[PDB]
Symmetry: C2
Subunit: 181 residues, 2 copies
Amino acid sequence: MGPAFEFAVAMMKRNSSTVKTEYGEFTMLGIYDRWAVLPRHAKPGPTILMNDQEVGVLDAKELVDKDGANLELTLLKLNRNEKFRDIRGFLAKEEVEVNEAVLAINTSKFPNMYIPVGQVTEYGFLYLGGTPTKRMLMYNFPTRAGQCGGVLMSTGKVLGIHVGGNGHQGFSAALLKHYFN
Amino acid sequence: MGPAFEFAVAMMKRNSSTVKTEYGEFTMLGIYDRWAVLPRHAKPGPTILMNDQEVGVLDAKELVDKDGANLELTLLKLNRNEKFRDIRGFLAKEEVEVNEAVLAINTSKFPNMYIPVGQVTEYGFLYLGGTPTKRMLMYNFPTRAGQCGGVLMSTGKVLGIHVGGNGHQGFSAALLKHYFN
């Protein structure tokens, strides 16, 4: 658990930011170049607040699989002058299962917070507010209304982005290497 | 940081509960026998919600030093049939300074959450909403309106109870062994 935590803290300090869209406040993870990821529910507009600064948005892609199934992620390309530290090496080629994970949240209502959630298993397909969603990962999480965007991590791995739960389990969209390029 | 986290998780699972008084929702730490501690601002009444159950309160003591100075803690004795696991061995005889600490929060709006706050130093005397307060500990904490009751911990040590901050530093009341007995 402790190595997962030490990994998550460093990762978050290097690659995360707090974002505000018109739909609420979220944790954002920068991935490489100018591309970051948000849960789909953040619905970024042409402009966002990133760490309380206005940043333009050049492109947003709502991700679906090869047959149009929802993946519940939005990739966004930011008009900034800095690049993100490339972390594509920490993203897996397929859904990750792990014995001990930590969910990290970085928002003005949850500033730098970390939750041990224990074991992660690949759940795959489910309904999420009625919408058929694929490639979900599941773990223990006495759950909230939103507080989503969290980043799901274990030692040396970035697993996914927290997109919701049922009150007893939490669900993350698997964050796969091939989404990027 | 990681050993601090592993310590805090075990400690919280064994000795903490979520409390609701009429003044809000707080993290509570059970200490031994039937005695727990809350920040002074929780103002427990004759009854509390502990993990969503009504529990009676037999005695509440607002702690002050030998010359009546505020310490910002309330010790409360609960009418329950279980004893708390004794953790007086983890409380220090005097204010603790540490290089790496973790603040742990257990509430229905922050369920099992942990914040690395880095170094803790003994601040001693300060004003806290205008009230002269002693035996404060200080650490890094991009701060909130309440979300106090948090437990401040490092590897093998329970340092204090989070009682407020200024926006850049967070403050905990030192939780001293001799308060108990």
